[PDB]
Design a protein around this ligand. Structure first.
Ligand SMILES: OC[C@H]1O[C@H](O[C@H]2[C@H](O)[C@@H](O)[C@@H](O)O[C@@H]2CO)[C@H](O)[C@@H](O)[C@@H]1O
Length: 534
């Protein structure tokens, strides 16, 4: 449980949490209610883990792209602010927090990555990505890097990947199409290829992360970085005389950052909903409140019309909003987790060399499609699921490699084919009762694999296979993408990413989103154990 008569608030540690704590102090000074502001690591992952059980903070701050998924998991109070209040904020900021017609969070501010550059080492920043290698040659001689930004998070590399035609989910005639993922197209490949070539020609280093890139820019070691408004506070504190401007173009097309809208959601399990509503509407989303947070670390273009009039003078905000216009506001749908986890890994592996660009992206397309279908819960019709999978894996490890390969054959054939799966289930069931094989079993290598070398049925094996087929039934379109992952040998990636998207730790096996993902995880896990070997 969460303590009544208090507010706990989680916000990311790159944002202005101290400023927010100031707004919480003022809230205490008026209403007598303590406000604790914490900033956990892996906040976006920690919240759904914790909040699934009925625990966590009262208010959660993150960009709006995570909030649909939280809403689908029943983790968020509906927010219902008065029309009087709604008019005080920019309409498009309310759109970003509107999921399936209901509002699921208060918008706070618009964030967009811009090119930040050291005016002392680079008076005129490049208008194109294509210039940057030459410019790094020139600067490397002087003892400086042209460009350093965080390659570990795809938020930062996505503007390049999207530039020549990458997209997450196609948006055509008012609707996103979950089935149409744009990670593996000519455009995305071009953009990612450029980034890898940058790394291959020692213009950037693949292990560069947020910390490294920030320190390098703030200590004068590098001429350009890519970051968002929150970063400007530490650049100010340092010596550097910096500009904020448009991102460079790629193939003569603008970089398209995914724009986020920092948002505050109320935990559905909080006993303090009215208190939290009051804090957000009357203390934070006021000129005094936002100023407190913005002075700590800049929010970007705030959602409160009145305080944005003050910040719109700043040329760094005009730059932020130029890039915002050139990019796209992120979708808030549940499938965004799937997209981001697929792309996080494609980019890391392509940069490191663990995978070619073409293969890294082909895998991301497949895994995103699979997880996106799994997260789509609509229009579908005695033991822990953790232990069950442990039992199943145990049994299929005792098999020989030929037998493993033969089981895999039959199960592969079921993927996407409800008739074949139904048949195999009937067969495995009869065999389990009868104890013996019939003539029609003679062309199912799986049924033979249920029998040990003595010609006796191993009941455990038949039961394991039945469990697999039950899990398989729970799945829908995701089956065809599990099949792709198996063919292309990228199951280990799918497995890993499925586990991230569950958010809850696999102890989730002690909600339809959870049923489908549990099943998806079991199917991927079993197919992998068969294809790879324990
Ligand atoms: O890297 C993918 C990640 O990107 C976005 O996260 C941003 C966030 O928008 C900003 O508020 C800031 O903290 O930088 C983050 C990058 O680490 C998405 O909001 C997030 O869901 C996604 O995983």
């Amino acid at each position: 449980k969460i303590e009544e008569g208090k507010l706990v608030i989680w916000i990311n540690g790159d944002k202005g949490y101290n400023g927010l704590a100031e707004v919480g102090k003022k809230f205490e000074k008026d209403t007598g209610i303590k406000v604790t502001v914490e900033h956990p690591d892996k906040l976006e992952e920690k919240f759904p883990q914790v909040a699934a059980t009925g625990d966590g903070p009262d208010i959660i701050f993150w960009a709006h792209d995570r909030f649909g998924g939280y809403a689908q998991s029943g983790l968020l109070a509906e927010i219902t602010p008065a029309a009087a209040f709604q008019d005080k904020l920019y309409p498009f900021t309310w759109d970003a927090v509107r999921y399936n017609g209901k509002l699921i969070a208060y918008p706070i501010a618009v964030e967009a990555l811009s090119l930040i550059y050291n005016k002392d080492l680079l008076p005129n920043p490049p208008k194109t990505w294509e210039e940057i290698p030459a410019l790094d040659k020139e600067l490397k001689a002087k003892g400086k890097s042209a460009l350093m930004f965080n390659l570990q998070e795809p938020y930062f590399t996505w503007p390049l990947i999207a530039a020549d035609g990458g997209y997450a989910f196609k948006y055509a005639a008012g609707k996103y199409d979950i089935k149409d993922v744009g990670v593996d197209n000519a455009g995305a490949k071009a953009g990612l290829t450029f980034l890898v070539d940058l790394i291959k020609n020692k213009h950037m280093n693949a292990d560069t992360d947020y910390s490294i890139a920030e320190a390098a820019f703030n200590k004068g070691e590098t001429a350009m970085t890519i970051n968002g408004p929150w970063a400007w506070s530490n650049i100010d504190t340092s010596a550097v005389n910096y500009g904020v401007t448009v991102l460079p173009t790629f193939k003569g097309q603008p970089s398209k950052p995914f724009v986020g809208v920092l948002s505050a959601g109320i935990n559905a399990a909080s006993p303090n909903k009215e208190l939290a509503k009051e804090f957000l509407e009357n203390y934070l989303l006021t000129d005094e409140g936002l100023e407190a947070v913005n002075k700590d670390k800049p929010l970007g273009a705030v959602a409160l019309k009145s305080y944005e009039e003050e910040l719109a003078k700043d040329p760094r905000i005009a730059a932020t909003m130029e890039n915002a216009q050139k990019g796209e506001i992120m979708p808030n749908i549940p499938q965004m987790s799937a997209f981001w986890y697929a792309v996080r890994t494609a980019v890391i592996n392509a940069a490191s060399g663990r995978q070619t660009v073409d293969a890294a992206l082909a895998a991301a397309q497949t895994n995103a499609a699979a997880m996106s279908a799994g997260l789509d819960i609509h229009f579908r019709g005695s033991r822990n699921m953790k232990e069950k999978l442990e039992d199943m894996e145990s049994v299929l490890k005792d098999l020989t490699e030929e037998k493993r390969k033969d089981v895999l054959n039959s199960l592969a054939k079921c993927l996407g084919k409800e008739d074949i799966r139904q048949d195999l289930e009937q067969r495995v069931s009869e065999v389990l009762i009868s104890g013996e094989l019939h003539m029609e079993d003679s062309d199912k290598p799986l049924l033979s694999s249920l029998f040990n070398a003595a010609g006796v049925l191993v009941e455990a094996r038949a039961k394991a296979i039945l469990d697999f087929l039950d899990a398989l039934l729970e799945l829908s379109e995701e089956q065809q993408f599990v099949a792709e992952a198996l063919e292309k040998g990228t199951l280990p990636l799918l497995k890993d990413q499925v586990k991230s998207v569950m958010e809850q730790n696999w102890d989730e096996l002690a909600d339809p989103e959870a049923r489908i993902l549990c099943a998806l995880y079991v199917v991927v896990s079993i197919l992998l154990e068969l294809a790879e070997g324990p």
